[PDB]
Structures are given as C-alpha cells and as structure tokens.
C-alpha cells in the first residue's frame, strides 16, 4: 500500500494530516 | 464445537503454501506442494503466519 | 561479471531453555518493589519420658522464616542510520534487490531477533546460576549490585575431596549407584530426574557396574542408550535408571566473543521434575509504557527517531526478569571431579 | 548475553553483524566420437553370423 | 545421522571388542547392525543403524587413464547430515547451435552434426558446466583413521 | 497550529521527551491580560 | 515470462515489491 508512504516520487512526503475527532476537528474553527 | 454441523472451511493464501525451510525445488516437491509418480499432488506444505517479522 | 545468490546460510550455536522449562513453571508477574519466600521449620521434638507428679516444660510453638528481593533490570538496545541501508546487504541477490527503505525493515528485523535471543540467554543463565548453587549475583558496569540467597543448607552443594574420587578410583569393580544414594539422601523429597553434563556423564558410563546394571536378566528394569545418540542438540533425554530419569545438558550462551557452557565442566544435579519454581517478573520503568498503561510485563518493545543530523531510529527491549526457587532444597549438586 | 543495565542508565548502542560474501565460476567438458562408413561395412563383435 | 567408509576402515572401525558388546545388551543401547556379509559385489551396501546414525560403506570406481581408481582413500571416515544442504549448479552452454534451437544454461545438452565435404564424417558431442557446491562448508568431519 | 489553537483560553498539551530515560511533563499556558474599559466608575478609599 | 523478469529494456530493474502478506503492508501505515 503506497497510500500511507512518501508517494510516487516523494510528492506526499508532507502530506500529514492529523487524525484527531470530528469534535477537534470542528470546534475550534466553528465561528 | 456443539453446533449441527461441525465442518468448517478456511481460506489460504497463495503466499503461505511453499517449500519447508525455504529450500529448492526437489523432485518430489515443487513449490511447496507434493507431487507423486504422476503428476498429480499428495499434499501440501503450508508455512505459518507471521505478522511480525521475527 | 554479473551475479547470482544461490544461497545464503545463517550459522547459530546450541541454545535451549531446558532448565527453565523443566524446573520453573508457572509465572507470576508482579508489582511491587520487593517479594516474599517463607519457609517454616517443621522440626517435632520427641516427646521426652515424664514422671505423672511434675508435669512441666511447656514446648515453643513453631515460626518460620521470610526474605525479600529486588528483581534486576536488563534493557538491550541497537540502531539504524541512514549510512548503512545504501551499500547491500549480504542476503540479497546482486539481481533482484531492493529500494533502500526495505533493507531497513530487514535490519529492524533481524535487530529484533538479537534482542530477543540475548534476554532468552540471560533468563537461562539466571535460572541455571540458581539451579546449580545456592545464590547468584546480578552485577553490571551502571548496575548497582544485588544479589539473591535463597536459604539452601550448606551441607547440600556436595563436592568430592581428596577421598572418594571417581575419577582416581578404579573403573572395574566399583559402584557408583551406592554413591548417589548416600549424595540424594540429603534432598528433601523423592527425585525424579538427573542433568548430567557431557564429561559428567562420559565418566559415569564407563563403569564396569553400570553396564552390569543395563544387561542383566533379571536384576533390573533400566534401560539406557551407551552408544552415540545425539550429537547436534543440546538436550539428550536418554533412558531411565532404575526409577530416574537421565537427562545430559550441553546448552552454550556467549560473553563477550567466546562460546562458554552453562552446566560447568561435568557436574551432576540431582532433581525434581515437578520441583516447584517461581518465574517472577518485575515492572517495566519506563514512562511510555506507563503511559500505555502495561506494567508487570515482560519484553516490552519500542523505537523513535533521535531527529538528530545523520537521524537513527533505536530498538530497544526491556525485561526486569527475577527467578526464583521455592524450596532450595529440592535439589542436590554434585562436582564429581 | 545481555548484561544488566541500571533503569536510569542508558544502554550501550549494540553493534549489528554483517556477514561475508564468496564467488565462484564454472568450467566445461565435453567429449566427441566419430564414426565413418568403413566401421559400418564390416560385421559386429555381437551380430549372429 | 550418516557416517561413510570404506571397508577398510568400517573393517578397523568394527574390530573392536566394545562395539560387539554394544550388540549384546539386551537393554544397554538400540542399535541393530549387519557386521557379518551384508553385499559383495554391489558398490553401495548400508548396514543398519548405531544409536541414531546409519553406517554406509562405500566403494565405488572412477578411471581418470586406465586402470580402476576407487573414490574414496584408503582409510576414511566422515560424520555428515543426511539432509545437508548441497546444491548442483550448471552453468550456460557457450554453443552457437545452442541459442538457435532455444537451449542455454543446462546440463547435457547433445549435438550431432555432419561436415560438409567431399569426405564427409559424422560426429557426437556432449557437454556442460558441472559445478558442485555445499552451503555449509563445516557439517562433515573427514579424518583419516590410521 | 498543529491541532488549530490561535489565541483561545488556557492550552494545555501533555508531551514525552524521546529518550533512554524518558520523562512526561505536562504543562497548561495562557496569555491573560484583563480591563476595566471605564477606568472611573471606582473610588478605593485607604479609611484610616 | 517477462513479467517476473528484469524487464523489457532493464525499465523494471528497480520495481521489486516486497512479497509479504496483507497485515504486514496494512498495519504499520493504518493510522
């Protein structure tokens, strides 16, 4: 599975995004 | 196992059946699985699965 | 000049956890910083002889005994770092190969296996260094030193003298039978089984009365195996002798670069198959693996990554490992020099 | 063996092993045999008469 | 498990009083044996069993100019594995027929072929690229008895 | 910004340094600063 | 077969995937 590594030619090497809740998600941005 | 009937069936992958302790192909044994006089089989070789590496 | 890697052998010496697994059974893992072993004497004066008129000397009550111990700490640990994944590796075709991220998950691999195996040999030599003698010593360059005495009589842990010397005295002629019985008559309890060592028993079976004992009609029922039977394993479950059971242990651990043998140079332990024994492992000091929640376990495994310059991403295992011996006088030992 | 470390003590970075590499090459044989009619018209060591 | 001599060496080997009276004991070992004549014509003759390993006596011929050379030394003796790993390698075949009828890296691969001329002669050919190995060069003990 | 914190009351974070001995901390921060828009509606007296 | 082969032109020299089961190419990356 290439899906969770650095990608195809390293093009998803800072692609990281957090896997937090959708209450953390939502909330702090809500307004 | 107290059910009406006790059979069951699991599935294997390909991957698992080969040559025990990862040796060559002998005459009697190619690719993990058993073969007589004739070509058809007599059993099977199936490894164990690891998750882990050790 | 092209290439093809046909084979590739790995070489290992003879390594198995015999005396762990016959005499320690039953794993108690713990959390607290020191444990209890009681005993309680059991010896009953005789009733003397007393006149009906004076009727005194009222006896003491029995008490026992306890101890405590700390367990020890063991923590191995090896490494990764980018320079050593480019070159190759000797397990891999010069065809075929690999992107260098998976040489890295095959020395995290094989770093995995070797922490394993060094805890293993330092759990044998742990319980082989109680089996034999009374008491052991953990010591260690950072580790402060503990040590743990269970309470074994001193007349037990025989050893021959300038008399009664198989090797000096005659090979023809002579019993040894009557020399176990008098040396097995201190164990408290029946004995069930015997853990030569390879010199031990070569000397043992060269009696001319021991092969008496295995071909005759109608003076016994053992059976043994003289002739070579194992010879690549470290363990030879040989026949019994008489009612006991002959076991000759050749097991090998390594410090520093040589090979060295567990059983010492041909000794003899008389034992107990079903001895009771104690395998106690402490807690895991580690504030990771608090915070996961686990403690009072054993082989505790993790990584990181150092974000260092030339980076390296750590394995490490972690044990805290304690056996102990219920009852040290369950079993007997003998040098036989 | 693993030798014993102090909980606060930080372990030794054990060395990994490596291991050694050999080569080899290979080398032919053949033999040859050579037959012309003049054996062919005479008869056998083995053929009835 | 296996151990290989040749006679004269199985002979020093059996002529001891001890390894009869390893035979006697009706209790004292498992070993069953054929010392008596077992083969004597016949190359390869095993001869049972002794504790765990199985004695083989082997005496086999190779002529290299003339004569009959036998393969082993007079008097050896060697402690091995019987399932020790050995592999046979065959190299490629450096025959330009070869590549045109699809054969390359294989063992004896045979030709036959006629010159063209006013006397023409037929010839027979055989060849390959015998190669024997063992991965672990350290299983097998080769001494040399007396 | 890691979890999309900007300017809110009292962020607290419970982290682990990476090391042979490692060592949780936990620490809660804020940036208080409090007003009185109409600095005059008071009269603190110092009595006696 | 060409597939298991070097390749055509030496193109897939380096194309050489790891031949382990599902869990072992899932798990680590799962999160």
């Given at each position: 599975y290439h899906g969770g590594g650095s990608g195809f030619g390293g093009?998803?090497?800072?692609?990281n995004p957090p896997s937090e809740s959708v209450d953390a998600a939502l909330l702090p941005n809500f307004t | 196992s107290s059910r009406l009937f006790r059979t069951q069936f699991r599935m294997v992958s390909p991957?698992?059946?080969?040559?025990p302790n990862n040796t060559g192909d002998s005459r009697n044994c190619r690719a993990g699985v058993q073969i007589n006089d004739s070509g058809a089989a007599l059993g099977y070789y199936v490894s164990e699965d690891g998750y882990p590496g050790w | 000049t092209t290439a093809q890697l046909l084979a590739a052998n790995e070489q290992k010496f003879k390594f198995d956890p015999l005396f762990l697994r016959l005499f320690f059974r039953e794993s108690y893992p713990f959390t607290t910083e020191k444990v209890y072993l009681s005993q309680i004497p059991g010896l009953v004066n005789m009733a003397l002889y007393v006149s009906p008129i004076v009727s005194g000397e009222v006896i003491r009550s029995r008490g026992g005994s306890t101890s405590e111990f700390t367990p020890g700490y063991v923590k191995p640990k090896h490494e990764v770092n980018?320079?050593?994944?480019?070159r190759r590796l000797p397990?891999?075709?010069?065809?075929n190969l690999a992107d260098p991220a998976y040489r890295r998950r095959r020395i995290i691999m094989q770093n995995m296996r070797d922490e394993e195996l060094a805890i293993a040999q330092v759990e044998e030599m742990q319980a082989v260094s109680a089996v034999l003698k009374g008491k052991y010593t953990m010591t260690g360059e950072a580790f402060d030193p503990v040590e743990v005495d269970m309470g074994?009589?001193?007349?037990?842990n025989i050893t021959q003298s300038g008399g009664t010397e198989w090797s000096k005295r005659?090979?023809?002629?002579?019993?040894p039978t009557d020399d176990i019985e008098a040396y097995a008559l201190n164990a408290s309890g029946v004995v069930n089984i015997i853990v030569f060592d390879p010199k031990g028993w070569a000397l043992f079976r060269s009696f001319k009365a021991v092969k008496e004992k295995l071909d005759t009609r109608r003076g016994s029922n053992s059976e043994l195996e003289?002739?070579?039977?194992?010879?690549?394993?470290?363990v030879s479950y040989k026949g019994m002798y008489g009612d006991v059971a002959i076991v000759v242990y050749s097991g090998q651990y390594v410090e520093n670069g040589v090979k060295k043998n567990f059983?010492?140079?041909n000794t003899m332990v008389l034992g107990n198959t079903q001895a009771r024994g104690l395998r106690t492992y402490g807690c895991i000091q580690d504030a990771d693996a608090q915070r996961e929640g686990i403690?009072?376990?054993?082989?505790?495994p993790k990584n990181w990554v150092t974000?260092?310059?030339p980076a390296r991403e750590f394995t490490m295992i972690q044990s805290a490992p304690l056996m102990l011996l219920?009852?040290?006088?369950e079993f007997v030992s003998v040098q036989l020099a």
């Open positions: 093009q998803l090497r800072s692609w | 991957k698992r059946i080969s040559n | 980018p320079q050593m994944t480019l397990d891999e075709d010069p065809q074994r009589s001193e007349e037990n005659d090979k023809s002629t002579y019993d003289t002739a070579v039977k194992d010879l690549g394993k470290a059983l010492p140079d403690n009072a376990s054993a082989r505790y974000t260092g310059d219920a009852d040290p006088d």
